[PDB]
Amino acid sequence: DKAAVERSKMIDRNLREDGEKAAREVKLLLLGAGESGKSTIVKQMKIIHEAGYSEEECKQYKAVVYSNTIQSIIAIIRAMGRLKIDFGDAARADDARQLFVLAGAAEEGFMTAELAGVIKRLWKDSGVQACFNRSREYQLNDSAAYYLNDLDRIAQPNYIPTQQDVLRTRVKTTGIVETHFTFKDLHFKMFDVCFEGVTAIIFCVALSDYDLVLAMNRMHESMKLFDSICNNKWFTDTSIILFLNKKDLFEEKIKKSPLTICYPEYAGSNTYEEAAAYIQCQFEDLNKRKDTKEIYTHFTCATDTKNVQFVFDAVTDVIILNNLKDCGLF
């Protein structure tokens, strides 16, 4: 590849006693609005480039899986009230009450056969399903269906979270998180959040946000943020990578909700191909120097390890081709 040839032109290692063993460093910022997939990308770097989630590491997330699951079903049940949606079978009302009894007396996320039964019956009720499909009207974890559909597995007494279970978790990130990994002989220093000596920025956008935060919308907030970042002077020589993320969730809701909810002027078809393209153009068009800065856009599913590996391999080649000269040796 051209990236291997390009890096082979460097001579700065020759200036160093032990240059062939020096570490060339890459500083990478992860930016984007809340819930766009930043921490998930961080988890994937650990999985792909460093030690996987040991059986004991996964175990640590067990009560997070329960907590996320409990939160999800509760959001849907409470929404039924505000949106005036009745249960399919009126016996579910007792189960709804029982959900609040059990959650209300517990210390933290937990699972029992009794709770599992309550949640399972609620989740396969037609009215609950009707409310679920109107999730754009309220706030619901994107991993709700993932965990609730797999409730039987999760509820087993000897449950051990799989890697996907962990990637699917929602954990609140406060402050700045710095992770380190080595790939293609590059020592990445990755920061989950404006830094100056930044080699590359990966900006995450939740595509599936286009019909969310009704009461400008989520997608427009993300655009406003990208506009600011992409055009900042501090990032002139910084490679700007755009992850249009949650493409899996987007593909599913596109055939259900029209893009016009977000962009009223959109007149294309409501298909994945045309709507994804349109969003990509909306973001890329925010670049205020279309002759000195290129944006590198990828459609990602951050919870998909193989897709993130493929995409990050491509991002790495962009960095090697464009930024290697400003990357120091240590």
Ligand X SMILES: Nc1nc2c(ncn2[C@@H]2O[C@H](COP(=O)(O)OP(=O)(O)O)[C@@H](O)[C@H]2O)c(=O)[nH]1
User: Nearest approach, Cβ of 320 to ligand X (angstroms)?
Assistant: 26
Q: What is the DSSP string of 215-244?
A: ---HHHHHHHHHHHHHT-GGGSSSEEEEEE
8 known ligand binder:
no
97 known ligand binder:
no
Q: What is the DSSP string of 281-317?
A: HHHHTT-S-TTT--EEEEE--TT-HHHHHHHHHHHHH
173 known ligand binder:
yes
Answer whether 80's CB lies under 8 Å from 128's CB. Answer: yes
- Closer of 41 and 324 to ligand X (Cβ): 41
User: Nearest approach, Cβ of 232 to ligand X (angstroms)?
Assistant: 20
Answer whether 48's CB lies under 8 Å from 257's CB. Answer: no
Alpha-carbon gap, residue 34 to 64, rounded angstroms:
18
User: Nearest approach, Cβ of 218 to ligand X (angstroms)?
Assistant: 12
244 known ligand binder:
no
User: Nearest approach, Cβ of 303 to ligand X (angstroms)?
Assistant: 5
User: Nearest approach, Cβ of 205 to ligand X (angstroms)?
Assistant: 10
User: Nearest approach, Cβ of 18 to ligand X (angstroms)?
Assistant: 38
- Closer of 37 and 161 to ligand X (Cβ): 37
167 known ligand binder:
yes
Cα of 190 vs its chain's centroid, Å: 16
- Closer of 143 and 322 to ligand X (Cβ): 143
User: Nearest approach, Cβ of 127 to ligand X (angstroms)?
Assistant: 24
Q: At 172, is the secondary structure helix, strand, or coil?
A: coil
Q: What is the DSSP string of 97-116?
A: HHHHHHHHH-SSS---HHHH
192 known ligand binder:
yes
Report how far apart, in Å, the C-alpha atoms of 235 and of each of 35, 41, 115, 244, 252 are: 23, 21, 50, 20, 35
Q: Residue 170: phi, psi to the nearest 5? A: -110, 110
Nearest to 240 by CA among 250, 228, 230, 227: 230
Q: How many helices (H) and strands (E) does the chain have?
A: 14, 6
- Closer of 224 and 325 to ligand X (Cβ): 224
- Closer of 297 and 322 to ligand X (Cβ): 297
Amino acid identity of 8? Answer: S
Nearest to 124 by CA among 156, 169, 74, 87: 87
69 known ligand binder:
no
Residues that bind ligand X (CB under 6 A): 32, 34-40, 142-143, 167-170, 173, 204, 245-246, 248-249, 301-303
- Closer of 169 and 199 to ligand X (Cβ): 169
- Closer of 39 and 199 to ligand X (Cβ): 39
36 known ligand binder:
yes
Amino acid identity of 235? Answer: F
142 known ligand binder:
yes
The annotation places the binding site at 35-40, 142-143, 167-170, 173, 192-193, 245-248, 302
Task: Provide the annotated binding site for Mg(2+).
Answer: 39, 173
Sequence ranges of the binding site for GTP: 35-40, 142-143, 167-170, 192-193, 245-248, 302
